[PDB]
Amino acid sequence: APIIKLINAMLGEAIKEGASDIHIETFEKTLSIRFRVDGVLREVLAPSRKLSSLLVSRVKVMAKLDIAEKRVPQDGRISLAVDVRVSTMPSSHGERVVMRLLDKDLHSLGMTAH
């Protein structure tokens, strides 16, 4: 389906930019996608509001979670070498999805000489 490619391309774009978390959040009027690239949140894409249910449904079935259940929080896992941990949660305008992307010299990093 078209929605299957969109989530896969989004995950590829998340790894491209070096994103840790991917925030799919549905509001009354707007559907918003945001990557927390190394801690800093970022507006990446705001698609049609109608897709909200389909994006939540696709990410659920990838992580082997319940599709019809939209009243309780559900945590799952996916293996793409990128190990993600999805975490859905109920809200006012449907569910809110977040999936944490995790990959399976000390002076150069930042530390001073002392």
Binding site: F27, T30, R36, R71, V72, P73, S87, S92, R96
Partner: protein, 145 residues
């Protein structure tokens, strides 16, 4: 008072409580605080019983007794969404306060309310439920009677 509250709700972590009796406009003050923080650079989520109204740009979960979704379970679920700021409707019991105190220590800014008559009454109330006297000093940023 606004500038002092601004700086407090814009801290990276800690608990900020709004206290007073029933019909004292606590929610209205919290809602105004969240709307001020409502930016694209932060992830704000709330647990409410019930949701007073909808802030566009902020996630808002409701306490549902049909699926046993409580304040404690709702707050425990919100913390797994990678939030920057959290707003709990109110911390009525110890279990909900324990999670809020852990949340504040673990890099989250927490916001809530308590039905106490004074600003000292809030610090009081946390000591009553069973929060170790220390844990209040480390986490608590301030109280708004």
């Amino acid at each position: 008072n606004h500038d002092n509250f601004r700086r407090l709700i814009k801290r990276p972590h800690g608990i900020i409580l709004v206290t007073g009796p029933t019909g004292s406009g606590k929610s209205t003050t919290l809602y105004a605080g969240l709307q001020e923080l409502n930016s694209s650079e932060r992830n704000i989520l709330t647990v409410e019983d019930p949701i007073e109204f909808d802030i566009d740009g902020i996630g808002q979960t409701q306490v549902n007794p049909r699926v046993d979704m409580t304040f404690a379970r709702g707050l425990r679920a919100i913390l797994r969404q990678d939030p920057d700021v959290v707003m709990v409707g109110e911390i009525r019991d110890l279990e909900t306060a324990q999670i809020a105190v852990q949340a504040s220590l673990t890099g989250h800014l927490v916001m809530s309310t308590l039905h106490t008559n004074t600003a000292v009454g809030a610090v009081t109330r946390l000591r009553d439920m069973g929060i170790e006297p220390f844990l209040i000093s480390s986490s608590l940023l301030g109280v708004l009677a």
